[PDB]
């Protein structure tokens, strides 16, 4: 199948074991911004669901399908690949909705639906939007979408912005300098100090921050789920040209994302921006190996290249340069293993 | 190999991927009780290493091998299956010990060792001692051990004792009670509450605690690493009979462990007991879904059964009984996925 | 049979009037200084409403309010009491030399015969959550003896209800119900009765006081005008509510209290049992939800509190509540006659 | 039936309503001394239950029947008159003992048992043993007992002892002196002070105390449930003659009770003595109207006469006298309405 070919078996096992936990579902469900906004987006666009055929990609507990049922849906196919599918089925029965919601255990790339659907709903967003590579499942599912069919969410915007955070940058060296001692119990650890620094900088940092560390207006990269193909997400090139609003040292790039539910009645936005109330996605920061000095008015140009890997994530390549000075910095990061810094 | 047959590929990949990180090595190395006690046990028993052949099972960064080198060992084979092995090689070169420490990359069940060794050193203890199933690798490695060779550590004591902690219990019960709601955003979740309680209580709690929550003298289960066979750890049955010292609610069993380095000069103990300074093993508690009320003087009887699984851990079944009232409790826990509360 | 006996089980009535036959209970009520003091002020500061008037005291007990009416210059006071306390009231009338002003009439106010119509009716018919004991109906029934322009002391009653958060109370009750969760109490599996146990405990309104900050919204007020209301109005009391949540959190239930007003010719005097006011022997009453409802600030909590009078001189309470923004719903049934005294 | 003739209808209603609550059953079940001792007495005398026919009088939740089942009983008839009977049925089913425990709804004086039993088990004890008059139900049940049959408990001992408690005695007057004031809000209450004192002294005091207040070894009155008639409990005359161990003022008599389970293997005792751990029965004290002075070595003689009434309780008559001085005191108390003093 399409899923197995793009996914290492070891990664897939871990991945679906993770979502097999009721606590993990619960964690997502208790993210009120997320869950509430989904329910709002569905109910406020009830004309998009009333007596419609619905597909829920990766239903988990089945909560979105229930929201679709609340909106008056006729039939909802709730596809789930982890063992959570059995718990979703129990909920369908206990909520007396067996006539409207059909839980289909398995990967959306492998299961079969009896009919085409009017609208696809899903929550496939990971860290930096693209983590977990579930957007491709979401896009793959369009084989079951009627022409003129709709997608909830419909589009996704990932935002990038340069930031200054001296403490975050110095923190890495403070942690790596553990190895920079000549006699740890009689052992000289110094030779590994470089490797330690390297390791720390490969980890994207997950947490939140004050918006005042941002030094330029964000650059936006948009995915239209109605138009995109899964293969479009294998190689994501995000060019940027930041016009610096403040003078100072750029320590790296901050990432966040919005999704839009473009319905017939209204468009509802779900945002994980640092200007908005915190979600379980927080924000993500990728550090530069060497900070870049910029004057207000200077331009910071370059590219953020996301390359999909078989561990259900992306290898991040970031190249940036201050055009006025030619001062350049790059970093390679491993999105699969972020550092959860939030406290 | 013996490792591969008893281990799911999915588990091993993640497992050794985890130990390839320098931050994790730093975390373990910064456990001063551990590192200091190991160095203490090796250096003070230097005659057990002087001009001897040493095997370091799961050497990681190689610290124990350096300790063995400090004790005057002639040759040390440092085996590590994670990529950390490459970092160990770097330290050996930079510490000018290339003539004495030989890093052998790979699983100890799969590598080929050049010669038989006089002594095996290792740090194979996981949470509640048995987690990670590395003790079996440690035991497996005795195929390279000379007839009268030694092992560091030499023995392991697992201690279990009944505890009372309403706060911890309610803390987990609260998390499970989310699945109690009859109308979460209009959705009835209650039918899953049973499965939810089951899931949360299967998680052993890793953290530390005050010793005054303990309601009886601990029961000891000992593994002699010099004598034990790999197969001995597939099924670990620990019967217990506690004489309750305090009245109250028994919320579960607390676990910790000691290991002893029985050398020629002296025996050095490394303890993770809650009466001792804290280590990175902390202590482990297994909660009962329903606590058992017991009075002082009662006997708390039952069995703690550990069944090894293919995910490099154990399925824990605890059956406990207040003999005077017949109050019985049964519990199943997944040692692989503990709750880190510390 | 009289209107009283038909709406009252004899078994309940016996216990009820037997309870009020005890001097200790009279002492308990009389030692409520807020209560007694406020009644005395309401009567004395409106002395013109009593001067040379004919008074009816419904459920006079020890006769304290009749003495207050006598102090304000009443010509004759008919003090009706159905319990044996009537005998003690008479003793006080004689020992206080007020035989020419206070006439104790033993019996139920629904059954006795008065020689004449009265200018004003005084009573203290309030129970827990105002309506408990169903004496308001006796109070209203007595209006058959009231002259057309007659007055009522108290004149009006306000019931206040507001949502509250109190995790401590909820877990306190939940823990008590969880006794029946034990699978091996002395070797016996009790679990099958947990549902019945939870139901039983949560049917008990909690009588006590609390800090006002646990309240999550402005109280909704329901008013009974004793000058206009008829007995039948209290047989089935429907109180709709729409709360605008001021705080985010878990709604564990609804808090209840009441005010009564003595609207006299000289001034209006209020007797309040609100948690913002000094504590009375009425305390406050809280009705718990079996499972709390999550609400954000700005949300609306709407629904209905329905009180159905029963033959045990109390009410069957039904509370239906809903977080409108999410559709999160709770339904609960309570037995007001058997509250939990927590103070 | 025998029950209805000796019981006022009004009393019976509240009585069985009281035991219809799971919380009250729970209250009894959480008395570890009581429940544990019952279980222990049954299990340690397993030969008295093995393959026997058992009768459980007033099974409540059915706990004692389950204990009988644990001891290997062949058939257990669990008779229960309150609504608790249905909850017992639920527990029997849920514990898979449907073939061995049969729940019979109704009063034991009115139901029909298909066969005679080998042993009757019950927990019919109230305050000072005899309150609630359920022992008569217990003894009545022997009509279903084989001639060679046993009773669990087998005997009941009531202990009586003189006590000194200056605080308790003075407390009555302190509470009554509320009424001894000439202008309570302008009212002279003094005329009721006597009636108030009378009221307090009629109430036996339920609570516990330090054994240091006891001034003589208790006098014991024994009921052998194997030998006794129902009628033996209609009029209970307990003569007493105490040999005073301490000098001082005797303010009244303290009451407690024991029951013994005399089985074939061993005799197990359940005690509510103040020398033993506290149970939900506590202890009961009856005050003398006027305290009696006695020296150590004097004899305190008299009678405690318990006269059964139709309110499922007893009128307590106490006459006591110091023989050496002729100093005499009496009290008449209403056991149905005790004062719960325990804190
Ligand atoms: C819960 O505590 C975690 N923990 C675990 C351990 C156990 N030691 C694991 C170390 O040993 C390595 N290891 C595990 N199984 C191995 C095997 N078949 N062959 C070779 N190396 C192996 C593994 O890669 C790591 O470097 C420890 N020594 N300290 C700890 O803190
Ligand atoms: C929480 O207790 C509420 N509560 C109620 C009351 C109301 N009861 C006062 C007095 O009213 C008497 N009473 C009740 N229904 C009556 C009736 N049809 N006819 C005559 N007397 C009646 C009853 O004998 C009692 O002595 C009060 N005076 N204080 C209170 O505290
Ligand atoms: N290819 C796939 N096919 C089916 N389910 C998948 C696939 N990839 C991910 N999932 C599931 O999709 C879910 C994403 S988490 C979202 C859970 C739930 N729909 C909610 O909105 O709260 C997880 O439960 C995954 O197990
Ligand atoms: N005459 C009677 N017939 C049947 N049941 C009765 C009678 N009198 C009292 N009971 C019940 O006897 C019980 C006394 S409480 C003892 C309950 C239970 N056997 C236990 O040991 O925990 C109550 O549940 C009463 O409803
Ligand atoms: Na320790």
State the pairing for strand pair D117-122/D145-152. parallel
CA distance B181 to C293: 9
With the most atoms of ligand 2 within 8 angstroms of its CB, the residue from C63, C80, C81, C208 to mutate is C81
Instruction: Give the helix ranges, DSSP H, for B189-268.
Output: 193-201
CA distance C41 to C23: 24
Give all strands of the β-sheet with D145-152 in edge-to-edge order: D101-105, D75-80, D53-57, D117-122, D145-152
Q: Is C116 helix (H, G, I), strand (E, B) or coil?
A: coil
Q: Is the distance from CB of D299 to CB of D321 less than 8 angstroms? A: no
| CB nearest B199 (choices: A23, A186, A195) | A23
What does chain D come to in residues?
343
Using CB atoms, list chains with 3+ pairs below 8 Å to chain D. B, C
Q: For residue D167, what is the enclosing H or E element? A: helix D166-176
Instruction: Please give the annotated binding residues of D for S-adenosyl-L-methionine, written as ranges.
Output: 25, 34, 58, 80, 109, 137
Give the residue from B49, B53, B52, B111 showing the smallest Cα distance to B80. B111
Helix axis angle, B32-43 relative to B63-70, nearest 10°? 30
CA distance B22 to D118: 76
CA distance C101 to C109: 19
Give the residue from D99, D66, D40 showing the smallest Cα distance to C182. D66
Beta strands in A164-282 (DSSP E): 205-207, 219-224, 235-243, 248-262, 267-271
Q: Give the tokens for residue B214.
A: 């303990």
Q: Give the tokens for residue A56.
A: 């829920």
CATH code of the region C156-343: 2.70.160.11
Q: Is the distance from CB of D151 to CB of D57 less than 8 angstroms? A: no
DSSP B230: G
Buried b (16+ CB within 10 A) or exposed e, C103-133: bbbbebbbebebeeebbbbbbbbbbbbbbbb
Pick the ligand that lies closest to the CA of residue D111.
Answer: 4
The answer to whether the annotation marks C59 as part of a ligand binding site is yes
For residue C62, which residues of chain D lie inside 8 Å, CB to CB? 189, 192
Helices (H) and strands (E) in chain B, counts: 9, 16
With the most atoms of ligand 4 within 8 angstroms of its CB, the residue from D1, D27, D81 to mutate is D81
CA distance A184 to A177: 12
- Classify the C-alpha dihedral C239-C242-C244-C247 as positive or negative: positive
Buried b (16+ CB within 10 A) or exposed e, D223-256: bebeebebeebeebebebebebeeebbbbbbbbb
Asked about A31 being catalytic, the answer comes back as yes
B326 with D40: Cβ contact below 8 A:
no
CA distance C105 to C108: 9
Distance (angstroms) between ligand 4 centre and the Cα of D80 equals 6
State the pairing for strand pair C315-323/A75-80. unpaired
| CB nearest C291 (choices: B181, B186, B326) | B181
Residue A143: exposed, middle, or buried by beta-carbon count in 10 A (0-12, 13-18, 19+)?
exposed
Asked about D123 being catalytic, the answer comes back as yes
Give the residue from B27, B25, B41, B30 showing the smallest Cα distance to B271. B41
Q: For residue D67, what is the enclosing H or E element? A: helix D63-70
**For C67, phi and psi rounded to 5 degrees?**
-65, -40
- Classify the C-alpha dihedral C248-C250-C251-C257 as positive or negative: negative
Report CA-CA distances (Å) from B291 to A104, B254, B301, B329, C185. Answer: 38, 14, 14, 8, 10
State the pairing for strand pair B155-163/B145-152. unpaired
CATH code of the region D155-343: 2.70.160.11
Buried b (16+ CB within 10 A) or exposed e, A189-199: bbbbbeebbeb
Domain C1-154 has CATH 3.40.630.10: no
CA B231 to chain CA centroid, Å, is 17
CATH code of the region B1-153: 3.40.50.150
Report CA-CA distances (Å) from B6 to B134, C63, C188, C267. Answer: 12, 88, 40, 89
DSSP D244: B
Q: Is the distance from CB of C123 to CB of C146 less than 8 angstroms? A: no
Q: Give the tokens for residue A111.
A: 């299961």
Q: Is the distance from CB of D54 to CB of D65 less than 8 angstroms? A: yes
Distance (angstroms) between ligand 2 centre and the Cα of C59 equals 5
Dihedral, B97, B101, B106, B110 alpha carbons, nearest 10: 160
Using CB atoms, list chains with 3+ pairs below 8 Å to chain A. B, C
**For D132, phi and psi rounded to 5 degrees?**
80, -15
CA distance D124 to D134: 5
Distance (angstroms) between ligand 4 centre and the Cα of D307 equals 22
Report CA-CA distances (Å) from A39 to A30, A36, A150, A280. Answer: 13, 5, 16, 17
Report CA-CA distances (Å) from D24 to B161, B288, D15. Answer: 34, 27, 12
Give the residue from C122, C126, C316, C319 showing the smallest Cα distance to C235. C316
DSSP B60: T
Is D19 near ligand 4, meaning CB less than 6 Å away? yes
CA distance B227 to D46: 47
Q: Is A280 helix (H, G, I), strand (E, B) or coil?
A: coil
CA distance B306 to C164: 47
Q: For residue C40, what is the enclosing H or E element? A: helix C33-44
CA distance B290 to A166: 50
**For B144, phi and psi rounded to 5 degrees?**
-100, 0
Q: Is the distance from CB of A76 to CB of A69 less than 8 angstroms? A: yes
Buried b (16+ CB within 10 A) or exposed e, A150-183: bbbbbbbbbbbbbbbbeebbeebeebbebbbeee
Helices (H) and strands (E) in chain D, counts: 9, 16
Give the residue from A276, A293, A272, A304 showing the smallest Cα distance to A215. A293
Evaluate the omega torsion of the peptide bond into residue B153 and state whether it is cis, within 30 degrees of 0: yes
Contact of chains A and D by CB distance (3 or more pairs under 8 angstroms): no
Q: Give the tokens for residue B141.
A: 């490695």
Q: Is A83 helix (H, G, I), strand (E, B) or coil?
A: coil
Q: Which residues, 6 or more positions from B288, have their beta carbon under 8 angstroms from its beta carbon?
A: B201, B250, B251, B252, B318, B320, B329, B331
Q: Give the tokens for residue B242.
A: 């506690």
Domain B155-342 fold is 2.70.160
CA distance A109 to A139: 10
In chain A, CATH 3.40.50.150 covers 1-153
Give the residue from D226, D233, D227, D228 showing the smallest Cα distance to D262. D226
CA distance C330 to D47: 53
Dihedral, C142, C145, C148, C152 alpha carbons, nearest 10: -40
Which residues, in sequence order, are bridge partners of residue D256?
D159
Report CA-CA distances (Å) from D261 to A102, B298, D48, D153, D255. Answer: 61, 22, 11, 5, 21
Q: Is the distance from CB of C310 to CB of C337 less than 8 angstroms? A: yes
Give the residue from B280, B286, B324 showing the smallest Cα distance to B304. B286
In chain D, CATH 2.70.160.11 covers 155-343
- Of the CA atoms within 13 Å of residue D272, those in its CB half-sphere come to 28
Q: Is the distance from CB of B179 to CB of B196 less than 8 angstroms? A: yes
Report CA-CA distances (Å) from D40 to B136, B209, C64, C219, D32. Answer: 46, 35, 57, 55, 11
C327 with B186: Cβ contact below 8 A:
yes
DSSP D14: H
Q: Give the tokens for residue D299.
A: 């004899």
Give the residue from C11, C7, C25, C225 showing the smallest Cα distance to C110. C7
CA angle, B171 as apex, B169 and B172 as ends, to 5°? 70
Give the residue from B163, B110, B193 showing the smallest Cα distance to B283. B163
Q: Residue A195, by phi and psi: left (phi above 0), alpha (psi -120 to 50) or beta? A: alpha
């Amino acid at each position: 199948s399409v899923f197995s070919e793009r996914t290492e078996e070891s990664s897939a096992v871990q991945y679906f074991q993770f979502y097999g936990y009721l606590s993990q579902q619960q964690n997502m469900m208790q993210d009120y911004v997320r869950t509430g906004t989904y329910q709002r987006a569905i109910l406020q666009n009830h004309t998009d669901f009333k007596d419609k055929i619905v597909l829920d990609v990766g239903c988990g507990s089945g909560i979105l399908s229930f929201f679709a049922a609340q909106a008056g849906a006729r039939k909802i196919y709730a596809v789930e690949a982890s063992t959570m599918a059995q718990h979703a089925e129990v909920l369908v029965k206990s909520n007396n909705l067996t006539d409207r919601i059909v839980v289909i255990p398995g990967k959306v790339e492998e299961v079969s639906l009896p009919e085409q659907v009017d609208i696809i709903i899903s929550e496939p967003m990971g860290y930096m939007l693209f983590n977990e590579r579930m957007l491709e499942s979401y896009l793959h599912a369009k084989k079951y979408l009627k022409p003129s069919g709709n997608m909830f969410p419909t589009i996704g915007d990932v935002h990038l912005a340069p930031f200054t955070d001296e403490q975050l940058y110095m923190e890495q060296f403070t942690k790596a300098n553990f190895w920079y001692q000549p006699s740890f119990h009689g052992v000289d650890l110094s030779a590994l100090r470089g490797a330690a620094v390297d390791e720390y900088f490969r980890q994207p940092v997950v947490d939140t921050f004050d918006i005042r560390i941002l030094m330029a207006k964000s650059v936006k990269y948009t995915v239209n789920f109605l138009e995109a193909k899964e293969g479009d997400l294998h190689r994501i090139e995000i060019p940027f040209k930041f016009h610096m609003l403040h003078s100072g040292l750029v320590h790296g790039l901050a990432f966040w994302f919005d999704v839009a539910f473009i319905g017939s009645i209204m468009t509802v936005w779900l945002s994980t921006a640092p200007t908005e109330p915190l979600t379980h996605w927080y924000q993500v920061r990728c550090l530069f190996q060497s900070p870049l000095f910029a004057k207000a008015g200077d331009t910071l140009s370059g590219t953020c290249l996301l390359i999909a890997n078989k561990r259900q994530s992306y290898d991040i390549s970031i190249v940036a340069q201050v055009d006025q000075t030619g001062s350049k910095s790059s970093n390679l990061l491993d999105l699969k293993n972020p550092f959860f810094r939030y406290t």
